[PDB]
Amino acid sequence: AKKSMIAKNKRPAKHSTQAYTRCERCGRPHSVYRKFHLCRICFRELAYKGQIPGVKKASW
Amino acid sequence: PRKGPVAKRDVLPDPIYNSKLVTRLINRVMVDGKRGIAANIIYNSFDIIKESTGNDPLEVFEQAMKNVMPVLEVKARRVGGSNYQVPVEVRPERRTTLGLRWVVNYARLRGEHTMEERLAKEIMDAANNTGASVKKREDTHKMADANRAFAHYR
Amino acid sequence: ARIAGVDIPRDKRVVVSLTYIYGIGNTTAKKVLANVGVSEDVRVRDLTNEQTDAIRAEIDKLKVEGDLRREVNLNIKRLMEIGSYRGIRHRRGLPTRGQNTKNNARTRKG
Amino acid sequence: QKIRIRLKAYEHRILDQSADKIVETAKRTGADVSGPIPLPTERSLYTVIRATHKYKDSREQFEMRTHKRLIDIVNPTPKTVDALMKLDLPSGVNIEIKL
Amino acid sequence: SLKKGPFVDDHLMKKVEAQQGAEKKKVIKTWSRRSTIFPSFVGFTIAVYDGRKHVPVYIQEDMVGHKLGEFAPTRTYR
Amino acid sequence: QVQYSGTGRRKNAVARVRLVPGTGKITVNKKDVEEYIPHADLREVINQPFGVTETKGAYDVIVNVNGGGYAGQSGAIRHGIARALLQVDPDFRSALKRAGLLTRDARMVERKKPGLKKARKASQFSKR
Amino acid sequence: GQKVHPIGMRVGIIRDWDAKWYAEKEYAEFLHEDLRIRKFIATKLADAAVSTIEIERAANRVNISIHTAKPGMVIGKGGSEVENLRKELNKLTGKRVHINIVEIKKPDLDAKLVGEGIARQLENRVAFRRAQKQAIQRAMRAGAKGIKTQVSGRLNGADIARSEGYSEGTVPLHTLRADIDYAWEEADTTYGKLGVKVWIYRGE
RNA sequence: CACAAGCGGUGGAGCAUGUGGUUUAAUUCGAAGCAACGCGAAGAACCUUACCAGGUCUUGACAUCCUUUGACCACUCUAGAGAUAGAGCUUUCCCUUCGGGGACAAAGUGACAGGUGGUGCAUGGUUGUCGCAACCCUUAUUGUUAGUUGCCAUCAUUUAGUUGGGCACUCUAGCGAGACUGCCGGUGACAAACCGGAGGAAGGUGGGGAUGACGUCAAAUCAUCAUGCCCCUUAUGACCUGGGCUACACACGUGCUACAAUGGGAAGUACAACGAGUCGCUAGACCGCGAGGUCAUGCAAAUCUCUUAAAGCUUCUCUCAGUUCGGAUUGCAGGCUGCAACUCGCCUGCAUGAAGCCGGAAUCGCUAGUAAUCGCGGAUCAGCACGCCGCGGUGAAUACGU
Ligand SMILES: [Zn+2]
């Protein structure tokens, strides 16, 4: 079930400590960055294609 | 390694006595990279040596080193499924390596209330042909010059 | 005999020998010895019979005796005889605080 | 001194280009513009697992640098205000003029 | 540690206030295992849902600071 | 006055040293070098350039140091003192050059790699 | 999985970001607005063969530019289609938008165009061996240092999957100053999905 | 670093955590020699949540169409564990040529929706494992351009780099230089290459990163996402409260703390770097033994704060003991976040004071600022780290040989 849960995520929560983040492309609930609102492996996918401005591969 | 022999790891002679041997002795006492503690220990031990029935810490230390270092070590080897042991000579750096190693190891196991009361006492006992370090040397010389039997044509 | 309950050891300072009575830890010994004015001086108990009675009369104001073991015992006793989830565990030799029993009972169950 | 700029960007090429634009069009009509002083270039770091299901022990790391540049203007004139608040190029560079 | 007043639920406290008059009934059936045992719960018989059933628990006096969940376990070992 | 200035770097620490004729002494950050680096004997590492060249006095040394640890910012002080001595007379660039005392030590802290416990220490393994 | 994305290895070295704006404290909203935009305008792209799209933005206006190979069939008769693009994009972004349409030259030398075209033959029951061959033939005639193609999946609409491609000229991948291009598309004939990849080397 | 030479471990003890096994109403699903087992999970009290027990709905929690049409609400009060139902002010034309279109509740109305259900042996995509060099990044030296919020050498001044002054020095960051067997000696087929020297901050791919060919294991993943075929459809779909995911006769892996004097305790004195901050980081003053609390202050940041680092050094103790070592377990009293800490959080104080005196067979990591040891920051996040990613401080032993 992953189409009712995205709907249930966007309605206002029943208590303060009941809201939680999800990805915005997919609905992945684990390991989302809250500066981009993207999950672990949409970040690595849109960093290539140079769409996220800023981000690039790091080496030092 | 496999390619061939390697360098020798130059050391920096300590400034107090200007003697690279005291540097290696400081490096062997030190544990966990706490070097100032090792330095304090060696200097207190030498103060204890000179103050009590001493002449100079370098002299008695060199003599103790001379009395402990080995001159005939054996190597246990494998041939084709049966293993033995054979004596061989001993190159110089290995000699001082072994000497320092034994002295520190057997001072660490003394049983007094300070590493200095152990180190000074042990290298004094060593500069007078006594102490488990000298007995370790003689165990080595006795293992050699006996196990030359199955070493005579190795 | 010695100064409280039984047998405060010899040869040690008072701030440490006073630990040996059930109910006196380390800061409690400090506070007791400070409400009177007794120091250690130096690594021995060479007190006076005024110092012993001094440090004896003040311990009476605490629960340092087999009057404390009674309290602890009857506490666990009240626990195990109502419901009780904590007492149920007290009766099995199992951790009574929530401890994910995979190894954490070798202390609690040997 | 009662007028000063701040410019942030992700590319020092565009950054220096626009800084020279403003400095040139400022000293053309006035004088005494303090140089484009460089600031210490913040950096961030993002580590991510590069596989969808397993294998934690192989990762890929990203970053995002943010270059900074400072310009202070000394003794403006009723023409510098005009000739400054009008030039606007380019797109992805932050400009923030505080008195 | 709710030193800003202990915690009951309104439904539970409503029911107990309503029966506070006369001799009491065993039908106080609430889920509510987070509530503490106020000193007025004595003598009643609360039914505490343990995830599967409604266990009854008789409130003596020694149980007066604990919670209602401490008297209805959930695991079923041996 | 006349003075001589040099800059010394070692392992995240940078020092700014000043040579000034005097009677032989060194103060760092408005304190005495006996108290600032009172460890045991690092001072006998600091006074080495005077020991090898321009033997051996007399200059008061004033330094400004910041960064690193107590053992890094003494090798840095030594570096700086040597450079300043070089500045006094260029004829010293041989005796100093023979005994090190003129080069920067480029031994920095190696960076940590992912999947490893440290820069090079790996996790514990089990063939089965 | 043992190759890096060739236009993510090179971003920030010799090529630029396809999204050039700087914002802080309004960054998530902007990124998802760009995603929405770009995921919408794949409507006309279904026929008009667009390749890239560059989003810039100002105080409250959003400057857009799209690279296509069909200028008239994307703007209208006298300008009756860009009108609709703007009046539709305003309904999403709630801002002012200004499309500045570019036109692409030499369209056979573009990774997305080539691969998307030679992934439309596979749907019309065409054999793959000559689709890729004619693709690299009409990519070399435009003048290119090298090209490489690859199709994957259930080939011929058959059983267990395999893969095969063809190469022409050199395509150096490890050279950072190389200016290579890349794209990955999909299609079906009747069975599952297929993956078509294409690399073109165009000097540096 | 495959053995050999070494240094420190694991296996013994307590605790944290993952897995098997058993148990259960459920202990959700995936990973299985190297290449599964602090792995997906970079955050299980409710949520997350797929699992279980009770209470509920059926064109539907979510999308399009067509018609009546059209502006939908939110707020208050009783019943209820809530889901929901019953009553109260009312969802009320924003285009008008008098003739239409956007948002939307209900209904009808069925096309239809919905599935973390199966098949990684039907697939795309994304990884693991065996495992050219240069162009790019960072670190080691310096010229020049620019001196604020950085810096203070030549001057007065105060609590002080603070305020007048200055951009010398350090620093920050744009653009350039510099390392090429490039010179000098020997070996060697005079060749490639190797050994030694000069000069220089650096010498022989200076140190480290990114970069992973053709292929191998029908290796991993329908549970990130897509998707061919099969299956469910008043239920395998959907809403709510409470419970597992944390159960414990045991077995295996990865870690943390110790078994003390190179130590434990009390007082004083020092020295970093990477990063984070607006309803966030908290200066300062006071109250509390403490964790903390109150009034208040600067800062959207080289300006203020998190942030006086810990090992270190100097004094005074303690004396080889299951102990002034060790800190498991239990009793009582508090604090903080949160609607709420029983199952099942972190922290504080007083009391208690377990095993453990260096660990067999066997087995692991590492070639230099490395091993060993010591702290600091942040992603995720109300709260919650012995795990993960980075940063710097002190700083070794050895490599005869295949
Ligand atoms: Zn995602």
GROMACS .gro file of C-alpha atoms in nm, chain G residues 22 26 38-39 41 50 57 63 88 99-100 113 131 138 142 149 169 171-172 176 200:
model
   21
  651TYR     CA    1   2.098   3.061  -0.667
  655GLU     CA    2   1.365   2.896  -0.095
  667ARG     CA    3   1.025   1.963  -1.682
  668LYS     CA    4   0.792   1.667  -1.618
  670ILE     CA    5   0.656   1.986  -2.097
  679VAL     CA    6   1.295   1.857  -2.764
  686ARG     CA    7   1.467   3.264  -1.269
  692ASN     CA    8   1.303   3.243  -1.777
  717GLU     CA    9  -0.057   2.700  -1.918
  728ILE     CA   10   1.000   3.086  -2.309
  729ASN     CA   11   1.291   3.173  -2.539
  742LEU     CA   12   1.745   1.245  -3.026
  760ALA     CA   13   1.864   0.012  -3.665
  767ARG     CA   14   2.394   0.862  -4.021
  771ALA     CA   15   2.741   1.442  -3.993
  778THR     CA   16   2.517   0.215  -2.917
  798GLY     CA   17   3.556   0.521  -3.433
  800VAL     CA   18   3.510   0.699  -2.791
  801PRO     CA   19   3.757   0.765  -2.507
  805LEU     CA   20   3.805   1.424  -1.862
  829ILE     CA   21   2.873   1.021  -2.915
   0.00000   0.00000   0.00000
